[PDB]
Design a protein around this ligand. Structure first.
Ligand SMILES: Cc1cc2nc3c(=O)[nH]c(=O)nc-3n(C[C@H](O)[C@H](O)[C@H](O)COP(=O)(O)O)c2cc1C
Ligand SMILES: Cc1cc2nc3c(=O)[nH]c(=O)nc-3n(C[C@H](O)[C@H](O)[C@H](O)COP(=O)(O)O)c2cc1C
Ligand SMILES: Cc1cc2nc3c(=O)[nH]c(=O)nc-3n(C[C@H](O)[C@H](O)[C@H](O)COP(=O)(O)O)c2cc1C
Ligand SMILES: Cc1cc2nc3c(=O)[nH]c(=O)nc-3n(C[C@H](O)[C@H](O)[C@H](O)COP(=O)(O)O)c2cc1C
Ligand SMILES: Cc1cc2nc3c(=O)[nH]c(=O)nc-3n(C[C@H](O)[C@H](O)[C@H](O)COP(=O)(O)O)c2cc1C
Ligand SMILES: Cc1cc2nc3c(=O)[nH]c(=O)nc-3n(C[C@H](O)[C@H](O)[C@H](O)COP(=O)(O)O)c2cc1C
Ligand SMILES: Cc1cc2nc3c(=O)[nH]c(=O)nc-3n(C[C@H](O)[C@H](O)[C@H](O)COP(=O)(O)O)c2cc1C
Ligand SMILES: Cc1cc2nc3c(=O)[nH]c(=O)nc-3n(C[C@H](O)[C@H](O)[C@H](O)COP(=O)(O)O)c2cc1C
Ligand SMILES: CC(C)=CCOP(=O)(O)O
Ligand SMILES: CC(C)=CCOP(=O)(O)O
Ligand SMILES: CC(C)=CCOP(=O)(O)O
Ligand SMILES: CC(C)=CCOP(=O)(O)O
Ligand SMILES: CC(C)=CCOP(=O)(O)O
Ligand SMILES: CC(C)=CCOP(=O)(O)O
Ligand SMILES: CC(C)=CCOP(=O)(O)O
Ligand SMILES: CC(C)=CCOP(=O)(O)O
Ligand SMILES: [K+]
Ligand SMILES: [K+]
Ligand SMILES: [K+]
Ligand SMILES: [K+]
Ligand SMILES: [K+]
Ligand SMILES: [K+]
Ligand SMILES: [K+]
Ligand SMILES: [K+]
Lengths: 207, 207, 207, 207, 207, 207, 207, 207
């Protein structure tokens, strides 16, 4: 397989739960293992703004998502926000790529300053210290200088800042086509195959 | 009226021509005067990726857009990329708010470094030196450190960096609802009335 | 009216609950709408160091403060520390000026780094990204370099750093006259009328 | 009226006394109140290089300028260099816009570093802490790196750096037309009406 | 004795003469030697805003303060603003702790930039080069970025920035109790005994 | 194969056309696909200073280079300076390593500031945002501070700055041996096999 | 002769064509060789705002200026905006001092960032890398922070930033006397004799 | 003579001994005095990679080089790596220009940080403190960020960073023509006559 075997996928409380769910579904279809983390605010976002009824407790959530995605047994692991026994809490874990999708401005801040107040924050701290892939998908507008300084610091350290800013050059016909644009760019960044967004200019031989 | 009487609206060659057109249409409906600028690459973007057939020459373009938006005579002015006689080229002009929507990474760079290679770039140079509103709507993913340093410099100087990153909390049902989300935030930033996005929590009295 | 129609007033756990209460009372008398936020530590400060018995729950608190200030019905809204449905959580809300009075060093830190761990912190994140007024009233001594770097970053971004450092040039005769000095400066910063502190030198014609 | 009711106009010892006098005269004609400050070196500049015989003492100076400009009684207030009873010494004063025209490199330095050795310097310190308009009109050539760092620091904080660098695009026929160019830009910056410099391109409809 | 034998106490022209006088009185009661410096603006502040009639000349002032505080003969030394023969002008002097209380923003600026235009400024220059204690008690609101950068530079070099920002956790009943709060913190910083402010939590054994 | 399948090779107007041609020829022999870009100034450099007669138009150029290198059909693609349909214009393209050989100081500047005025500049903007290899081969002497700051910024972001500074430790006998030294280092940087420069010390077992 | 034998004089599109022409005329009278460069925007400025009818093409322009100034044959050389065969394009050229008079903010930007999009920009890049004199004569008001950062960077590298900010201490009676003031300062900076501005205080023996 | 009478020529252990020898030979032919310094690693480079058999000891080396270059008696002085009696060790010496050709990355580091571990390093420390010419000829590829930061620091202080990066615009036919290109640029930087590289465009009159 091209790309990582295991992805830590953290959802935080920005608008854009759709991107996180679609990414989870694509990662499952490419037979990757997913370590799934979700914040309390992202639970509120999904509950109040989508019609996905995600159970609260980690075991019930793991069962629901496994069904939602047609995943294989053990393929999706769910860990709670203080579960320091989970692999992402330590750099001695097996290597995983991490994506925070969507990434709230508060989680962006925590990651940039090294705050470790929950497993999502610690898992990012670990990704950075181990030089493992870390992709952040912020969804905010406007971006303040605080936001931008936090993104720049992390980009300078090798994190990928991939805003939830879809393009229109594939002639999107639905919300889903926009969601898929961003998910495709994430998978491209991770080096995981995707067929939602063609390779620009692949057939163009001469100008 | 709340907000500026005159907006300089510059379209550049990022993906997202839809946002610029929708904004132009909303600004016309709020009876503002619009000084319209468009780059050669943004012409290519509109031509090759929308089904708006925008004429090439400024006078023909002014006629087309006036029709497209139902604008009043003289309400939309169009200026070409080297027309230094246009009001935006000088700070002695009547005050206008400026929005670059969408804003390519190259135009973001030019603005942040003070390059003045065309009227769009000069018009931004002028907005900043006069302390007149300047809103940039970048549409790129990922954002590199180069992009982020350019946005941060400009945000620190009082420009508003408003990425084309729509939210989902109004339950969007179409591409157009996403486009309108970003346009609404622009109009909110400018202080111009809009009814596309409700005021969050306006009826919420107690927690 | 001169000045903002709506103020988000956040009280945090620094010494100086008196300033926050006096400001709330003045804002009510100038017929402004107040969105009131208070941290758990500021509850402890008021409980253990004032003889204002503030109820714990938001609805009971809203009733108490409305009585305390002689406010009109709906004039004071109270929101709890995780109530993301409240207007201050989103920039799509109606514009409000925000004052954090008093501002603990921990809340100063959170605001300067973009941490968003409660509604007060998020509401400040929003104020800054929207370019809406944000006034911080720290009460600490000494100020460390950490404190000072956090204040400087925010001042450079357009927040007003207004320490709880009263002046003596109005010949204060009581604690209340000192409290009113600081409240007056806040209201002056906000552009809201006040008659507690005269306009210096207004009658002085020549030197 | 558009623009501020009251302007603090400080003249310091750079070459260009003409600009300060012309500005004072225009501000009087637009019926603004002017709080006039002048340094000892600027007195020497006016005395030795203009044929305006400005009296030394504040009361005599106030009488002379009131005559010179055709001002109304009390319209021009004059304050001496240590008169801390004057409104500009305190932020509790009524709001004024401040212009230092011309601005010597030493006064530029004092303002940028926060030195408060006289009323002009203090009045600028106050303008900056209150977020009130502050315009500096330096007249020096070359600009050293010291000068440029001082201007940049202040520009970054929201002061307007408006060098005494007139333009030629109105076809100036006299020294006075050059002086008026700079005065016009000052008044434009302040938001005060002026008819000396037309609005560039106001009649230009299309390119 | 705990703490320094000799304190250089400089009063400058900020509002808050009360703090400087109260500190002088406490230092006298703890049998310390005080080298007293006062600026011309601080003389104006005391004259116009307190009912302490401080004589102008150093010898007359030394006599007055010695009486005011019940000091011993030679215990208070007074030095004028250009008296370079005074111990504080040279680092070869016997070691003293220095406190500038209150500290105007102009004196803060001078100290941070190394300006040495009077004995107070030089005495601070010396304190910093000798690594002797230097405490600054600014009294200003708002603090501008200029103020904050000057405080941060000095704090980073080991000066103590102790704003005149009293706390309310000792249940102050008068202006004097607020003044004493700040004076207590100064004496704590200096390591000099004081009984005005109890030791927080000294009797609290367990949570 | 070790190393990238596809290289974007941009030639710009520095002295050293020989290096770009030799690299193109080596890349062809290692059966890589080459997306070839050349600036107008680099055309002038090749025309006026080499005896390679490179046709002007992209299709004619593609035919000429395919012959020059003995390339396979479609192996060399040529794109013009505004051809935004070419793969290098978008990060959604298939991954390529990019080398700018030689790299003029103006192209170095454009890349470091994010200017995107042609396809070479955009292609570098894309390489950096996608974290794809980007190698710059400047040929200038002296290097100014402007040059050096631009190289440092890009090196800090992960671009490889490989000046056209050949070594002499392989005992070069001709200009071609010097050219091959630099080309070898490029291919080593890219991870592409080369046999022009031996592996230093590969047979040295002990000191 | 004192000063340089050869000056590269670049005119760019700021207001102030008069200064460039007057300087050219003075340089000719001091029998210097002038390599003359002019941008397209500066052609528009001269055409639309002076009554100097400057031919478009370099040879016709060289003939016109030679007549205008009474220059000797070959004394004025004119080079077009892409003529890389001209001496200023290379540091291997004979040494020249360079002056950009007037200097637009866009040309200031290009020089400060190292952009080399035309011969003027390259010629400045070369001046800086060779440590040859480079004088920039900006004419803008206000100066933004972008402008000021660009000037500071270049001043720190040894370029002379000489704004078109004339002085009044020679009692100017006409526009021409103001123009000559700035030209005199340029010639003083270059070390070329001039008799338009006396040497300040040359006859003053004692104070 | 144009240029310096005395050059300190230091050879260090980068590849490119040829440049140092050729420069020494040209300096001798222009009848300059040369103070020659060579590191132990540069001895190894010359020994193992050239067929110049340079004696080890300073006196034997001085004799050999005097013969090699056809120098006059005393024209070449050789000093060993700890000979602090040599003129270059002190700024009280007669002024010399210094060139380090070639300049290893370790010697570049030492110079940039002020390390003074041998006479070459000290001689550069002295050149910089005396503001005497200092030219560094690094020969490395790639340049790391460490290298680039060290070059930038020194360039900012007025050292000339002249990489061993020859140009091809004189149609080089041999290794020697490339070596001579770099040597010519060095001599141009020093202001010493050379006829190896023509003056670009000297005969080009018009574009
Ligand atoms: C409906 C809803 C939408 C939100 N949308 C955003 C958003 O788009 N961007 C953002 O930064 N925060 C948004 N927030 C706020 C955060 O959820 C909040 O700041 C929270 O503290 C984030 O916590 P977390 O980072 O642990 O998920 C939203 C909250 C809610 C309730
Ligand atoms: C179809 C198309 C889509 C593009 N989309 C983007 C984009 O989303 N973001 C971007 O920064 N550049 C995009 N570009 C590239 C720019 O158009 C290019 O860098 C150009 O130089 C911008 O010039 P301008 O800033 O003058 O409009 C796109 C180009 C094309 C043809
Ligand atoms: C009685 C009392 C007084 C306090 N006074 C201060 C103070 O003056 N300044 C301060 O920064 N923190 C003070 N604190 C501490 C904070 O309350 C504490 O750091 C807390 O975490 C702040 O949380 P908050 O920012 O959410 O309100 C005080 C706490 C108590 C109990
Ligand atoms: C005739 C004259 C002209 C001066 N022109 C300038 C000038 O153009 N720019 C400047 O910075 N200083 C100029 N100075 C010097 C200042 O006046 C001097 O540095 C003084 O200290 C400024 O003090 P002030 O800032 O309190 O007015 C001039 C002085 C005189 C006498
Ligand atoms: C009544 C009065 C009150 C003042 N209060 C303050 C103050 O609170 N803070 C301050 O920085 N300056 C204040 N100033 C201004 C200064 O005294 C002024 O800037 C002066 O130059 C300070 O000089 P000094 O630092 O030598 O004492 C006040 C002045 C007066 C007359
Ligand atoms: C013959 C010739 C040689 C040049 N050599 C160099 C060089 O070695 N380094 C350089 O930075 N620029 C050199 N230039 C200049 C550039 O070509 C010029 O600055 C141009 O604008 C670069 O444009 P480009 O980056 O789009 O290729 C040379 C130009 C010519 C004509
Ligand atoms: C009549 C006229 C006057 C101008 N005056 C100025 C000016 O004073 N300062 C400036 O920076 N730009 C001015 N500009 C704008 C520039 O000419 C413009 O930004 C252009 O791109 C500069 O290009 P250049 O630097 O290649 O000459 C003016 C343009 C015109 C038409
Ligand atoms: C054959 C040879 C070639 C070397 N070439 C280089 C080179 O090109 N660049 C470089 O920085 N170091 C090169 N080095 C390494 C240095 O000589 C080494 O780092 C040494 O410590 C430099 O010491 P010096 O600066 O006192 O001369 C080379 C060494 C040898 C043996
Ligand atoms: C949960 C855990 C064992 C953390 C320690 O991990 P690491 O050594 O800090 O990478
Ligand atoms: C096109 C024009 C007159 C530009 C000059 O404007 P400004 O004086 O630089 O604001
Ligand atoms: C609670 C809420 C809808 C937050 C989203 O606000 P915004 O789009 O980030 O200003
Ligand atoms: C002259 C005077 C009362 C200065 C105090 O003003 P502020 O409180 O520092 O704005
Ligand atoms: C007044 C005096 C002797 C100052 C010299 O003191 P120091 O040597 O600078 O500490
Ligand atoms: C030419 C093109 C479709 C550019 C958009 O690419 P990307 O989304 O900015 O990587
Ligand atoms: C036009 C030309 C030969 C440019 C090369 O000059 P240089 O070697 O970069 O000073
Ligand atoms: C070898 C020697 C006398 C070094 C002292 O030189 P300098 O005073 O540091 O320039
Ligand atoms: K598109
Ligand atoms: K949502
Ligand atoms: K007072
Ligand atoms: K003009
Ligand atoms: K308290
Ligand atoms: K070698
Ligand atoms: K004058
Ligand atoms: K060449």
């Amino acid at each position: 397989m091209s790309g990582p075997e295991r992805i830590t996928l953290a959802m935080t409380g920005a608008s854009g739960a759709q991107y996180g769910l679609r990414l989870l579904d694509c990662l499952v279809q490419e037979e990757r293992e997913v370590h799934f983390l979700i914040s309390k605010a992202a639970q509120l976002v999904m509950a109040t703004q989508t019609d996905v009824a995600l159970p609260a407790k980690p075991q019930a959530m793991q069962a629901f998502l496994t069904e939602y995605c047609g995943a294989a047994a053990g393929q999706i692991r769910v860990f709670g926000q203080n579960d320091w026994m989970a692999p992402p809490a330590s750099g001695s874990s097996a290597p995983n790529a991490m994506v925070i999708c969507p990434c709230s401005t508060g989680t962006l801040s925590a990651v940039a300053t090294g705050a470790c107040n929950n497993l999502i924050e610690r898992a990012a701290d670990v990704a950075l210290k181990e030089r493992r892939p870390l992709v952040l998908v912020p969804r905010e507008a406007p971006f303040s200088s605080i936001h931008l300084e936090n993104m720049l610091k992390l980009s300078n350290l090798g994190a990928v800042i991939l805003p939830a800013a879809p393009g229109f050059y594939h002639q999107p016909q639905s919300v889903e086509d926009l969601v898929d644009f961003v998910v495709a760019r994430i998978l491209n960044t991770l080096g995981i195959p995707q067929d939602m967004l063609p390779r620009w200019g692949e057939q163009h031989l001469v100008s």
